[PDB]
Design an enzyme around this catalytic site. Structure first.
Site, PDB file in Angstrom:
ATOM      1  N   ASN A  61      42.481  15.395  65.070  1.00 54.10           N
ATOM      2  CA  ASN A  61      42.992  15.468  63.674  1.00 54.10           C
ATOM      3  C   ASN A  61      42.262  16.541  62.859  1.00 54.10           C
ATOM      4  O   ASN A  61      42.911  17.258  62.113  1.00 54.10           O
ATOM      5  CB  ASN A  61      42.781  14.159  62.907  1.00 54.10           C
ATOM      6  CG  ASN A  61      43.646  12.999  63.383  1.00 54.10           C
ATOM      7  OD1 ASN A  61      44.449  13.130  64.299  1.00 54.10           O
ATOM      8  ND2 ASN A  61      43.541  11.869  62.688  1.00 54.10           N
TER       9      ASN A  61
ATOM     10  N   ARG B 156      29.060  10.276  55.567  1.00 51.88           N
ATOM     11  CA  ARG B 156      29.483  10.451  54.175  1.00 51.88           C
ATOM     12  C   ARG B 156      28.625   9.524  53.289  1.00 51.88           C
ATOM     13  O   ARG B 156      28.000   8.596  53.807  1.00 51.88           O
ATOM     14  CB  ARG B 156      30.986  10.101  54.045  1.00 51.88           C
ATOM     15  CG  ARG B 156      31.943  11.072  54.816  1.00 51.88           C
ATOM     16  CD  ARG B 156      32.038  12.407  54.042  1.00 51.88           C
ATOM     17  NE  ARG B 156      32.232  13.591  54.881  1.00 51.88           N
ATOM     18  CZ  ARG B 156      32.339  14.840  54.420  1.00 51.88           C
ATOM     19  NH1 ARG B 156      32.289  15.088  53.108  1.00 51.88           N
ATOM     20  NH2 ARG B 156      32.508  15.850  55.276  1.00 51.88           N
TER      21      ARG B 156
ATOM     22  N   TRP C 183      43.083  20.015  63.949  1.00 50.94           N
ATOM     23  CA  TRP C 183      44.478  20.274  63.579  1.00 50.94           C
ATOM     24  C   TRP C 183      44.593  20.723  62.121  1.00 50.94           C
ATOM     25  O   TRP C 183      45.330  21.700  61.812  1.00 50.94           O
ATOM     26  CB  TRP C 183      45.302  18.995  63.872  1.00 50.94           C
ATOM     27  CG  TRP C 183      46.750  19.129  63.688  1.00 50.94           C
ATOM     28  CD1 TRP C 183      47.664  19.511  64.617  1.00 50.94           C
ATOM     29  CD2 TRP C 183      47.482  18.875  62.492  1.00 50.94           C
ATOM     30  NE1 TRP C 183      48.934  19.502  64.076  1.00 50.94           N
ATOM     31  CE2 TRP C 183      48.850  19.103  62.778  1.00 50.94           C
ATOM     32  CE3 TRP C 183      47.109  18.499  61.203  1.00 50.94           C
ATOM     33  CZ2 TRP C 183      49.860  18.961  61.827  1.00 50.94           C
ATOM     34  CZ3 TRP C 183      48.118  18.327  60.259  1.00 50.94           C
ATOM     35  CH2 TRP C 183      49.478  18.547  60.574  1.00 50.94           C
TER      36      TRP C 183
ATOM     37  N   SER D 144      35.071   9.187  65.226  1.00 50.57           N
ATOM     38  CA  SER D 144      34.244  10.388  65.327  1.00 50.57           C
ATOM     39  C   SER D 144      33.152  10.215  64.275  1.00 50.57           C
ATOM     40  O   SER D 144      33.465   9.936  63.154  1.00 50.57           O
ATOM     41  CB  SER D 144      35.086  11.608  65.006  1.00 50.57           C
ATOM     42  OG  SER D 144      34.234  12.741  64.926  1.00 50.57           O
TER      43      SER D 144
ATOM     44  N   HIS E 292      36.332  16.400  77.705  1.00 49.96           N
ATOM     45  CA  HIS E 292      36.496  15.699  78.989  1.00 49.96           C
ATOM     46  C   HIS E 292      35.414  14.642  79.160  1.00 49.96           C
ATOM     47  O   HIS E 292      34.519  14.720  80.026  1.00 49.96           O
ATOM     48  CB  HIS E 292      36.453  16.713  80.167  1.00 49.96           C
ATOM     49  CG  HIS E 292      37.589  17.712  80.128  1.00 49.96           C
ATOM     50  ND1 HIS E 292      37.632  18.833  80.944  1.00 49.96           N
ATOM     51  CD2 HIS E 292      38.745  17.700  79.432  1.00 49.96           C
ATOM     52  CE1 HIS E 292      38.765  19.502  80.693  1.00 49.96           C
ATOM     53  NE2 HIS E 292      39.450  18.848  79.773  1.00 49.96           N
TER      54      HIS E 292
ATOM     55  N   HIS F  45      44.349  13.712  58.944  1.00 48.63           N
ATOM     56  CA  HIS F  45      44.409  12.279  59.188  1.00 48.63           C
ATOM     57  C   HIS F  45      45.773  11.683  58.811  1.00 48.63           C
ATOM     58  O   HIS F  45      46.252  10.771  59.481  1.00 48.63           O
ATOM     59  CB  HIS F  45      43.291  11.605  58.416  1.00 48.63           C
ATOM     60  CG  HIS F  45      41.967  11.833  59.059  1.00 48.63           C
ATOM     61  ND1 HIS F  45      40.826  12.191  58.390  1.00 48.63           N
ATOM     62  CD2 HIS F  45      41.635  11.745  60.379  1.00 48.63           C
ATOM     63  CE1 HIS F  45      39.835  12.315  59.261  1.00 48.63           C
ATOM     64  NE2 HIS F  45      40.299  12.044  60.470  1.00 48.63           N
TER      65      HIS F  45
ATOM     66  N   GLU G 114      31.542  12.405  62.689  1.00 43.58           N
ATOM     67  CA  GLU G 114      31.884  13.393  61.612  1.00 43.58           C
ATOM     68  C   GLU G 114      32.583  12.742  60.436  1.00 43.58           C
ATOM     69  O   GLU G 114      32.181  12.954  59.258  1.00 43.58           O
ATOM     70  CB  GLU G 114      32.840  14.521  62.098  1.00 43.58           C
ATOM     71  CG  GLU G 114      32.836  14.900  63.563  1.00 43.58           C
ATOM     72  CD  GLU G 114      34.102  15.707  63.961  1.00 43.58           C
ATOM     73  OE1 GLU G 114      35.086  15.110  64.571  1.00 43.58           O
ATOM     74  OE2 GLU G 114      34.086  16.931  63.630  1.00 43.58           O
TER      75      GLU G 114
ATOM     76  N   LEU H 217      54.455  -5.908  72.829  1.00 36.32           N
ATOM     77  CA  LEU H 217      53.246  -5.036  73.092  1.00 36.32           C
ATOM     78  C   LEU H 217      52.019  -5.645  72.393  1.00 36.32           C
ATOM     79  O   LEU H 217      52.118  -6.118  71.274  1.00 36.32           O
ATOM     80  CB  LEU H 217      53.501  -3.692  72.430  1.00 36.32           C
ATOM     81  CG  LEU H 217      52.354  -2.680  72.340  1.00 36.32           C
ATOM     82  CD1 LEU H 217      52.093  -2.165  73.756  1.00 36.32           C
ATOM     83  CD2 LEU H 217      52.741  -1.493  71.379  1.00 36.32           C
TER      84      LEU H 217
ATOM     85  N   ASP I  61      41.696  12.320  69.742  1.00 40.66           N
ATOM     86  CA  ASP I  61      40.843  13.351  69.169  1.00 40.66           C
ATOM     87  C   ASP I  61      41.753  14.510  68.735  1.00 40.66           C
ATOM     88  O   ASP I  61      42.717  14.841  69.437  1.00 40.66           O
ATOM     89  CB  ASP I  61      39.884  13.778  70.293  1.00 40.66           C
ATOM     90  CG  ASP I  61      38.803  14.765  69.880  1.00 40.66           C
ATOM     91  OD1 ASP I  61      38.835  15.320  68.746  1.00 40.66           O
ATOM     92  OD2 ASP I  61      37.899  15.056  70.742  1.00 40.66           O
TER      93      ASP I  61
HETATM   94  C1  LIG Z   1      45.373   5.808  57.919  1.00 44.02           C
HETATM   95  C2  LIG Z   1      44.381   6.440  58.938  1.00 44.02           C
HETATM   96  C3  LIG Z   1      44.588   7.794  59.283  1.00 44.02           C
HETATM   97  C4  LIG Z   1      43.665   8.371  60.193  1.00 44.02           C
HETATM   98  C5  LIG Z   1      42.602   7.606  60.720  1.00 44.02           C
HETATM   99  O1  LIG Z   1      41.737   8.127  61.589  1.00 44.02           O
HETATM  100  C6  LIG Z   1      42.183   8.716  62.765  1.00 44.02           C
HETATM  101  C7  LIG Z   1      43.412   8.324  63.330  1.00 44.02           C
HETATM  102  C8  LIG Z   1      43.799   8.868  64.563  1.00 44.02           C
HETATM  103  C9  LIG Z   1      42.919   9.771  65.175  1.00 44.02           C
HETATM  104  C10 LIG Z   1      41.641  10.106  64.674  1.00 44.02           C
HETATM  105  N1  LIG Z   1      40.831  10.934  65.421  1.00 44.02           N
HETATM  106  C11 LIG Z   1      39.731  11.584  64.928  1.00 44.02           C
HETATM  107  O2  LIG Z   1      39.306  11.658  63.728  1.00 44.02           O
HETATM  108  C12 LIG Z   1      38.806  12.135  66.026  1.00 44.02           C
HETATM  109  C13 LIG Z   1      38.478  11.292  67.078  1.00 44.02           C
HETATM  110  C14 LIG Z   1      37.606  11.669  68.061  1.00 44.02           C
HETATM  111  N2  LIG Z   1      37.325  10.795  69.093  1.00 44.02           N
HETATM  112  O3  LIG Z   1      37.862   9.467  69.098  1.00 44.02           O
HETATM  113  O4  LIG Z   1      36.450  11.123  70.020  1.00 44.02           O
HETATM  114  C15 LIG Z   1      37.002  12.920  67.973  1.00 44.02           C
HETATM  115  C16 LIG Z   1      37.345  13.762  66.945  1.00 44.02           C
HETATM  116  C17 LIG Z   1      38.229  13.375  65.938  1.00 44.02           C
HETATM  117  C18 LIG Z   1      38.597  14.373  64.864  1.00 44.02           C
HETATM  118  O5  LIG Z   1      39.820  14.617  64.775  1.00 44.02           O
HETATM  119  O6  LIG Z   1      37.719  15.034  64.290  1.00 44.02           O
HETATM  120  C19 LIG Z   1      41.265   9.541  63.419  1.00 44.02           C
HETATM  121  C20 LIG Z   1      42.412   6.293  60.351  1.00 44.02           C
HETATM  122  C21 LIG Z   1      43.320   5.720  59.464  1.00 44.02           C
HETATM  123  C22 LIG Z   1      43.057   4.214  59.110  1.00 44.02           C
END
Ligand SMILES: Cc1ccc(Oc2cccc(NC(=O)c3cc([N+](=O)[O-])ccc3C(=O)O)c2)cc1C
Ligand SMILES: Cc1ccc(Oc2cccc(NC(=O)c3cc([N+](=O)[O-])ccc3C(=O)O)c2)cc1C
Ligand SMILES: Cc1ccc(Oc2cccc(NC(=O)c3cc([N+](=O)[O-])ccc3C(=O)O)c2)cc1C
Ligand SMILES: Cc1ccc(Oc2cccc(NC(=O)c3cc([N+](=O)[O-])ccc3C(=O)O)c2)cc1C
Ligand SMILES: Cc1ccc(Oc2cccc(NC(=O)c3cc([N+](=O)[O-])ccc3C(=O)O)c2)cc1C
Lengths: 222, 217
Positions: free
Chosen positions: A12, A61, A15, A55, A183, A27, A57, A121, A10
């Site tokens: 991105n 879309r 950030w 997520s 959490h 992302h 969010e 892995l 979580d």
């Molecule tokens: C190339 C690419 C790049 C990013 C991609 O997508 C990601 C990758 C790593 C982390 C995340 N992570 C979140 O988007 C994210 C996850 C949670 N979560 O799993 O509970 C909550 C909030 C977010 C948020 O940042 O808003 C999303 C997916 C791909 C396929």
């Protein structure tokens, strides 16, 4: 002792917002951090790494954009798989892939099949995975067996259900890390985390690096 | 809804043995101090608008305590308008043993205050499997098609499905794991870990965890 780590990645979105940038910027840095975590796990002899990125969010879309994101996911897999394969990584997708079209389903299956013989892995990537769904998938399997007269309800026990939920071939999940400050498990693994250490960090996923991963592994050791 | 927003709190009450060891006392002293902390937590939840409180620590010594205390403890719960339920595999207890748990549940079943669930011989994987077995029996009867089984259906067969969802899980004692307590039911719960040992976890610590929930939700 830490053989299987699962991470809820979580942060991105937040950030990118802190950087004054659009979500896609977050992302791209998120994907950099995925690559770094996979490499750290493979270089430190972790046997399995299971990554959850979902997520709602990101997916609330119009349909055009959702199909587009699905294609970008499989593109991301396609663009990494040759590297993973050369590094003896076994790639598996966990989750309900029935929503992908036939062409993207076949592309996901091809990357799994290419790397399935590898002995390093195991990297499990969650795509439309939920912990309640995973359990229900196994239950429907056992229910089909009961219907077919091949299994008695009385015979169903924990070891049986375990053999029908995701990842039963791998070491048990030792450690769950969730970045980004919340959490909660948010319906990631449930059955599989009964005895795992739970480590929560406020670090946002794009910033989570090798030092942050080693601190998680120390919490486990302690 | 109370200002803290929490309808159902679950607690892994760890730390009783460490609390006794720190003081050079034997385990029984920690259990007695742990029991006083349970009464205090029940009273605080009852007084602070919580609908349901579910407690895990449940061995042989605490089982001997369970059988003793039960009567006196249930009389005090009844006098505080608490509805008591035991969740877990009670089939393991002898038939006289099961009858008494049963009479305690029956006595308090009309109570309209806090619902207190005491998890005894309980595990989160066991709870899921018992619900699965119920569905399997209905399939075998030809009452249920495998393709009709969905998350909502399995949810309606796991322990406590008729109470509010668990909002908050507190674990005292310093460890950061669920230890096969509730699994299906905590898919969306806030998880709060504190190093305070269970005998020392008091009303201010419970207020702390509720207000953390309120602020983080
Ligand atoms: C190339 C690419 C790049 C990013 C991609 O997508 C990601 C990758 C790593 C982390 C995340 N992570 C979140 O988007 C994210 C996850 C949670 N979560 O799993 O509970 C909550 C909030 C977010 C948020 O940042 O808003 C999303 C997916 C791909 C396929
Ligand atoms: C599934 C998915 C796929 C790609 C994502 O991020 C990018 C990366 C490159 C270009 C546009 C967007 C983000 C997500 C969440
Ligand atoms: C190299 C790389 C880079 C970024 C990566 O980013 C992740 C990592 C873990 C999980 C996901 N997973 C999804 O992005 C994801 C895609 C689809 N999809 O394309 O229909 C659906 C659901 C999800 C979902 O549940 O998160 C995406 C994954 C890899 C392997
Ligand atoms: C019916 C009932 C209701 C609430 C109860 O609430 C208590 C009271 C006193 C002590 C404990 N619980 C432990 O002392 C306790 C049990 C185990 N255990 O099952 O391994 C492990 C650690 C502890 C520990 O705190 O050290 C839990 C205990 C019972 C028997
Ligand atoms: C609601 C409920 C239901 C069952 C419960 O069951 C227990 C569990 C652990 C301990 C005890 N009870 C004592 O440990 C206990 C022992 C002695 N003793 O043997 O000298 C004296 C007093 C107590 C006392 O105040 O609780 C009783 C405790 C509670 C609070």
């Amino acid at each position: 002792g830490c053989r299987h780590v699962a991470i809820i990645m979580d942060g991105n979105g937040r950030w990118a917002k802190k950087q004054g940038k659009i979500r896609a910027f977050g992302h791209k840095a998120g994907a950099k951090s995925v690559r770094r975590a996979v490499s750290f796990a493979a270089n430190n002899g972790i046997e399995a790494l299971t990554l959850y990125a979902f997520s709602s969010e990101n997916w609330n879309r119009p349909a055009q954009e959702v199909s587009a994101l699905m294609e970008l996911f499989v593109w991301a897999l396609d663009s990494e798989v040759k590297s993973l394969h050369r590094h003896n990584v076994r790639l598996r997708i966990i989750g309900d892939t029935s929503r992908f079209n036939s062409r993207l389903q076949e592309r996901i299956r091809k990357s799994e099949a290419l790397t399935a013989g590898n002995t390093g892995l195991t990297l499990n990537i969650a795509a439309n995975y939920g912990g309640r769904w995973d359990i229900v998938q196994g239950v429907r399997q056992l229910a089909e067996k009961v219907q077919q007269g091949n299994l008695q309800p009385d015979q169903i026990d924990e070891e049986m259900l375990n053999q029908h939920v995701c990842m039963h071939e791998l070491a048990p999940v030792d450690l769950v890390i969730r970045t980004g400050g919340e959490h909660r498990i948010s319906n990631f693994l449930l059955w599989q985390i009964a005895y795992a250490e739970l480590y929560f960090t406020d670090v946002l996923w794009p910033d989570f690096d090798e030092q942050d991963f080693e601190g998680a592994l120390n919490a486990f050791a302690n």
